[PDB]
Write a protein that binds this ligand. Structure first.
Ligand SMILES: CC(C)c1cc(-c2cc(N)on2)c(O)cc1O
Length: 207
């Protein structure tokens, strides 16, 4: 297991997300679904010229899996996946510059719900999760697990878990007071409200 420090700007963003009073926490799901859609777009585009890129799975979709026993909500996609280098490099985002721009915008009056416009929507997961685990598999690289409970560091290790084929799984270990996001009707409501027109099937698992 390798442990890394977040860049200062990202630690700052995470602390702000965790410590700022903001009731509209449901936006985290929209941001993660949006990220999954973008990753699915990427593998779709690559497959247009190299159909064999889909050898690792032809179906392009998103699964939402609540687990009340583990107090987790997991968002799974079969998108392009990330390399180890991507994970370390702020999970394939331009988080350093994006954070700067998000900050500049917040000063220009913007609110936290606009976070996705700056390429750092992922970190909104920390509105509802005490810990986030990201499992990912990119074609021709191994499966890796990233994990962080904030506090300035993250870990990366090779994943010995269930082989994914290709794509990304975001596991949200929810805060004790955020278990509404495991309720079927609540997830349905959020998806219908914020993600009604995503171009890939979204399947909400039941328990
Ligand atoms: C963790 C977060 C930023 C995120 C990244 C990817 C992703 C990005 C790439 N290149 O591959 N997979 C994704 O599918 C979903 C996500 O919520």
């Amino acid at each position: 297991v390798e442990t890394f420090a977040f860049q200062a700007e990202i630690a700052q963003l995470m602390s702000l997300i965790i410590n700022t009073f903001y009731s509209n926490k449901e936006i985290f799901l929209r941001e993660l679904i949006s990220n999954s859609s973008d990753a699915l777009d990427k593998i779709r585009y690559e497959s247009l010229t190299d159909p064999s890129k889909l050898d690792s799975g032809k179906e392009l979709h998103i699964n939402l899996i609540p687990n009340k026993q583990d107090r987790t909500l997991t968002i799974v996609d079969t998108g392009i996946g990330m390399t180890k280098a991507d994970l370390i490099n702020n999970l394939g985002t331009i988080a350093k510059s994006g954070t700067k721009a998000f900050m500049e915008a917040l000063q220009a009056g913007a609110d936290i719900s606009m976070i996705g416009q700056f390429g750092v929507g992922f970190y909104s997961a920390y509105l509802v999760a005490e810990k986030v685990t990201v499992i990912t598999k990119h074609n021709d690289d191994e499966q890796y697990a990233w994990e962080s409970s904030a506090g300035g560091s993250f870990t990366v290790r090779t994943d010995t878990g269930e082989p994914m084929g290709r794509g990304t799984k975001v596991i949200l270990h929810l805060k004790e007071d955020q278990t509404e996001y495991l309720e079927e009707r609540r997830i349905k409501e959020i998806v219908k409200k914020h993600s009604q027109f995503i171009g890939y099937p979204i399947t909400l698992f039941v328990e």
